[PDB]
Amino acid sequence: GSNQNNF
Numbered sequence: 918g919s920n921q922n923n924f
């Protein structure tokens with residue numbers, strides 16, 4: 918799957 922990190 919895909920992964921996104923929004924700090």
Ligand SMILES: [Zn+2]
Nearest residue numbers: 918919920921
């Ligand atoms: Zn993955």
